[PDB]
């Protein structure tokens, strides 16, 4: 390259939940975002590009409600993920030889 | 300018993922347990270590502890690695991540990948999860 | 379908800069982040993801230094813009029927 | 099933509005500097988003009241036969904050207005706020590579 780089580049800031909100767990099996995420890992984590799988783990974590929960005004309650982006190119984990 | 442009991946070593798994917190915190946090902790070992990290755990490390260890792990060389991973299982207060005993700016954490600060990582991607609550609201459903 | 979602899902929020940082423009041709947003709209909004082109929007941003400015402090700095997606599916603008 | 490719549904009759808030100067006591080149940002911003299909509907230097209400107009008129929701701020911020010509709103009121229990015609489509404001007063430093 010609150009230098920002010092604050290339960050990926993945968030159970946005600023201000509450995240949720299935009982004792962990929380919703990090069972959504392994789960897309697992199928994707090898293939697609980082944040496609993060939009993917967005999509699956919406999915879910409250379904039990010992604050009554819980229940039935949701949850939608964030991650933030200063990456500047496409991120892959391709299997390593 | 390649608008297919990506990271470049082909180093000897995937690289480090950090998790900082908090569980329980102390007693004057007034902080609940997390229950399922382990199951969480071991789930993302399976799956980063099948996508080549060296996964590194940590569990219920107090503030001092922590911030050792995560300077250490910013000092070492990462110039043979396509990135950098590091996992917050805890709770949350604004710009905060709790340890066992007291909490810790998030900056002060990503503060040490900068580029000023890690030469190594400099053009590599440094990947932040963190898996705590961000305030007091329940987000409400709603249908199409 | 059979789900429901959260309030706050499918929002995107795209910042000229992260948080706690300066944000720069040219001497009167417009802001640095706007200027390189508008420059991918134009060669790739009707084509491209719309997160993969702010993806393209944060390397371009990432190339400029200021050159010119009346706090000396501020000469040779850098920039990179932030965007925060709570997106649950890819999105494109393709040319509308 | 879960089909990894899955897009927004963009196929409505309209693409939607793009929302620009362009902000150049400010009440003298607010003691903000004048933000000279907005002007060709919004230029921009609007050929740009017209290109995609976009109604464009641009307001320069806003009081509070002014913003409040015509971004509550708009949260309130339907946008079921729309794809999206574009909304682009041009302007200085403090904290959460975004500056109109006499104050700063609170940038949760402005997005508030766009959840859906707040606007159910949007609901399950994507709404995409823009902000080229300042977020603090750390200039970025240059890097390069290790070799
Ligand atoms: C039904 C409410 S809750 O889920 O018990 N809880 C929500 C929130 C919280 O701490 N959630 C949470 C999510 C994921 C976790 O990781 C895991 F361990 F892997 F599961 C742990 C915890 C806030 C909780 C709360 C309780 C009392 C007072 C304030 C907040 C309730
Ligand atoms: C040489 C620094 S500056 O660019 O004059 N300026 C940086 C910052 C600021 O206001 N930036 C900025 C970026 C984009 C803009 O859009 C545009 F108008 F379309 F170009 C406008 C403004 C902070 C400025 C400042 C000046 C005095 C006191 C504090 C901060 C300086």
Known sequence: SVYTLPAGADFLMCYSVAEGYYSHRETVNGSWYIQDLCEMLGKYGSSLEFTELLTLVNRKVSQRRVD?????????????????????????????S | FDPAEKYKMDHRRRGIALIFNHERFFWHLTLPERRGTCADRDNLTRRFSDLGFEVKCFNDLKAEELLLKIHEVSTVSHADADCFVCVFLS??????????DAKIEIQTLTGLFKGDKCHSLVGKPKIFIIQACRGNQHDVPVIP
């Open chain 1, 68 to 96: 039990f929960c010992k604050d009554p005004s819980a229940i039935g309650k949701k949850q939608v993920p964030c991650f933030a982006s200063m990456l500047t190119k496409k991120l892959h984990f391709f299997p390593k």
């Open chain 2, 91 to 100: 709770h949350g207060e604004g710009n905060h991540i709790y340890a066992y």
